[PDB]
Amino acid sequence: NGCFVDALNVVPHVFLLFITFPILFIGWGSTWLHFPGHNLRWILTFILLFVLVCEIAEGILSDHLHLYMPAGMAFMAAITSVVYYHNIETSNFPKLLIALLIYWTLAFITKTIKFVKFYDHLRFCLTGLLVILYGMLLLVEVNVIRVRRYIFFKTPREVKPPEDLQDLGVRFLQPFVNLLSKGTYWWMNAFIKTAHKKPIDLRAIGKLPIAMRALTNYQRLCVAFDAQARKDGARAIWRALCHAFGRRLILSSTFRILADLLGFAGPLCIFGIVDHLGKNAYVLAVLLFLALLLQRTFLQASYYVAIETGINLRGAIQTKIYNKIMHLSTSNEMTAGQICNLVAIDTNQLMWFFFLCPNLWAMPVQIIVGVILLYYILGVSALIGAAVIILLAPVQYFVATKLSQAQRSTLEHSNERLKQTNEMLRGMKLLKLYAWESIFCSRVEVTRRKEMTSLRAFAVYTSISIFMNTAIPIAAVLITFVGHVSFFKESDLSPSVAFASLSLFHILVTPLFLLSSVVRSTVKALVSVQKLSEFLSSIPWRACTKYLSSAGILLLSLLVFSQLLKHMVLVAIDYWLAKWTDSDQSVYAMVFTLLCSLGIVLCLVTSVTVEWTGLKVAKRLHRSLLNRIILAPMRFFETTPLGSILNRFSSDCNTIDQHIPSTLECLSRSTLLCVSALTVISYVTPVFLVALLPLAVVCYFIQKYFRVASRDLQQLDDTTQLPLLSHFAETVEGLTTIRAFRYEARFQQKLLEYTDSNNIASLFLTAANRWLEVRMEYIGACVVLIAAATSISNSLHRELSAGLVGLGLTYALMVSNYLNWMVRNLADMEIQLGAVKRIHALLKT
């Protein structure tokens, strides 16, 4: 009686879905109470979601409606259980919980009957997993009734909802939300929507929870330092920090490694789909969708947990070294500058190293899984390719080091220039009273040429970096595919093999760059902690239009058309590989080699173009600014403060030279790669095009609401950084007066206040970045889901063309990362262009 047991299973889901609707409709028509097992409940509910997807897959394979209805009903039943638990977290009851418990017991009974009747005779594993999950959720409910007094005698002795994160006005509620929103940052919707209208400020911002303050982190760190020093240094302080920050860091690291595993897993199911159609695929498509969303969610949660641990550590060691500043002796100018660098660069190094700590653990497993996976797909030839990409990682590091050296030299020259300016902008009336100004401007221009000379080598190294970035992906495929078929064994290379190798090449290129910066950050952090131990123990298109018109018509088109042609080559190589796959193999491989050479030559040309153009623009802009400032009237110089006039030259110039060319290059590459990927996934499946324009319009709404806040928070950060450092300096000089007045307590209070005001800003900023990241990624996974779902049917059932699905899947598996690069670089370019606009504001004097 199989259908009989199927119906018997359908019944309890129906019972629960029917009782949920009155209460849900009353509730749909500010104290958060959490219960033990909440996080376990949500984890188990997501596992139920997964197993139910698998059951739906089984029902599709078998088909008989009544035979696969139980899965479709348990789906809504679990979603309604989630709705119930949200309605109970928002307002507590003893009865709604019993309402859940009844359903759990009945579903367990039905599943047991299914299991018995099966034992008497794929289904087996799924039914067993569901049984185990329902049983564990039952035990969770029993724990919940055991905790409070719903079935017990009258009173609960109920907790009294937590005042830490729910009492007096606060806004950053990360630890006090639903474990789904703890992942998807849903609580930021309200903040960002309100931020769109009203400008954010410290009165509109929250206050940090008791879970993360100066006092809390200082307390944990001093407890660890005490427990380590009572057993008596650099290693000591290190182990103290380690044992003090404990579980959060390793939790982030394991989130990260699981995400890395699933990311290495994606391309293999791509490969399986490509195999199946050329010779069980819808299941692989939905599994790919699920795995993408879960992997990226875990990656983002990992990032956030690491960032928060780092912010805790910064606050802690900052207030600690300020506590040490009170007890130091007067015999120990140079020490003050060393102290304020110990807070401005050493502490930032420590905290950014703590950002990158889990990446250092997750990188080796990533490259190992990558190489072993690509070996089993391409054989011995794979190994050869696996060398080339890896060889880029040490070289990169070398390049980076050269940059640093260059930077140092340049900085020196820059400093001297500033000196030769500070005189002219002070003896203004003296200077213009006899018109010796041109004589000094000649000297100022003499310094500028030396500065320009340094910048050439720096930008050459930047060009080499950008060149290798996109050259190694091309070279890997070149020397691998040419060295696999036409060299070793003449093995027929199915489209699946080549496209899986392509996907893995990108998924391995992305982490490789980060290892170099990680090594540099780690050694620098080691040096900075040795230092700390030695111390402690003693904008419109008009701004960009003018910026690019200062370059001239000579280089504008030379840049733009070269970029367009490089991206066209980068897509055409894969387009021709698509026809290469199905099987004149030798002629095919030769054409592939020609395309590979064109790509690298064009990339080098584009990089050199960007370098030369940026340098020329900086030159002309500086000269024009100097000339326009020279011919100003005296009353203008007397009216405007010196800080603004000097500051533009001091930073604006420096900022532009250091960051505008690289960021502009990155923005251009990102936007063109995204447009190319969209065009590829459109040409592969025509109908998919018409489905992708809706989602993209969604991104437009996600753009505005982001920038109008991301800019705002940004500037707030800057402000909370300025009085903090200055405060430090004030304590160092007048140290004797402050230790004499015995005013140490009030000043320590002020510094805790300032570090809290800094942390709230630097925390909301990372929360907003996580928000934009996760939502853009969810859409980037929706697009690949829809693309694969259209490709499996349209390109197989009717079109019956296999070279198509490869390109579409390979580009849709990665379009999301290009999208994120695009949006972030766009925000940075906008803030930098807004910085540039004030130079033109000064130009019209």
Binding site: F4, V10, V14, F18, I19, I23, F25, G29, S30, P161
Partner: protein, 133 residues
């Protein structure tokens, strides 16, 4: 109001909560009450006719607990026929199965109770005279 220590009394006022609502929401939740109950008992009846084996189309050696029942659709028609007390009588519940007698004797009383509350509360609503305010 901010920071209300909700101890659940907001829903504990079960009908004095929803008699406050607008008309579309209250009409929605009333139709959802009625459809919920009807579908629940239609499912249980479908199942009981399936289980007795009267659902298996056969001539002789049996009499269905509910005469002339064929599929889920006719079963839901029987549920709405007995629940809301129209009583069409094309499908007859018979004196062969006392289990069907039990399901009827609970169906009707729950139907009558939920009808009684869903009339009292709508009347308690039509004494909304705030409009006179």
């Amino acid at each position: 109001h901010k920071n209300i220590r909700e101890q659940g009394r907001f829903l504990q006022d079960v009908f004095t909560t929803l008699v406050d609502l607008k008309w579309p929401h209250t009409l929605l939740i009333f139709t959802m009450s009625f459809l919920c109950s009807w579908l629940l008992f239609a499912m249980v009846w479908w199942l009981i006719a399936f289980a007795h084996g009267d659902l298996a189309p056969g001539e002789g050696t049996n009499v269905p607990c509910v005469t002339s029942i064929h599929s889920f659709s006719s079963a839901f028609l029987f549920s709405i026929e007995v629940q809301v007390t129209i009583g069409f009588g094309g499908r007859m519940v018979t004196e062969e199965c006392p289990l069907a007698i039990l399901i009827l004797i609970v169906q009707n009383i729950v139907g009558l109770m939920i009808n009684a509350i869903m009339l009292g509360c709508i009347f308690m609503k039509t004494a909304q005279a705030h409009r006179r305010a």
